[PDB]
């Protein structure tokens, strides 16, 4: 109980975050704005070929235990 996700955002690879069904994309986001002191609406989350909007939550979208996010920020100097 209690689902871990790892999350990836400017690196090779992710760190793991405790989340449940109940965790929305928006919540996951703003892990990484506190994390990185970077605002959560210029942020999107990218899963399994699937940039996932803020308000899907876990039990309403792919993810499961353990599957890997790329977090990336946008607007982002490429």
Same mark, same amino acid.
């Given at each position: 109980?209690?689902?871990?996700?790892?999350?990836?955002?400017?690196?090779?690879?992710?760190?793991? *975050?405790?989340? $449940?069904?109940?965790?929305? +994309?928006?919540?996951? /986001? &703003?892990?990484?704005?506190?994390?990185?002191? *970077?605002?959560? $609406?210029?942020?999107?989350? +990218?899963?399994?070929? /699937? &940039?996932?909007?803020?308000?899907?939550?876990?039990?309403?979208? $792919?993810?499961?235990?353990?599957?890997?996010?790329?977090?990336?920020?946008?607007?982002?100097?490429?």
């Amino acid at each position: 109980m209690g689902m871990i996700v790892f999350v990836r955002f400017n690196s090779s690879y992710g760190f793991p *975050v405790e989340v $449940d069904s109940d965790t929305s +994309i928006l919540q996951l /986001k &703003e892990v990484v704005a506190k994390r990185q002191g *970077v605002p959560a $609406d210029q942020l999107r989350v +990218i899963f399994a070929g /699937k &940039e996932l909007p803020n308000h899907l939550t876990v039990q309403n979208c $792919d993810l499961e235990q353990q599957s890997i996010v790329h977090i990336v920020q946008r607007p982002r100097r490429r």
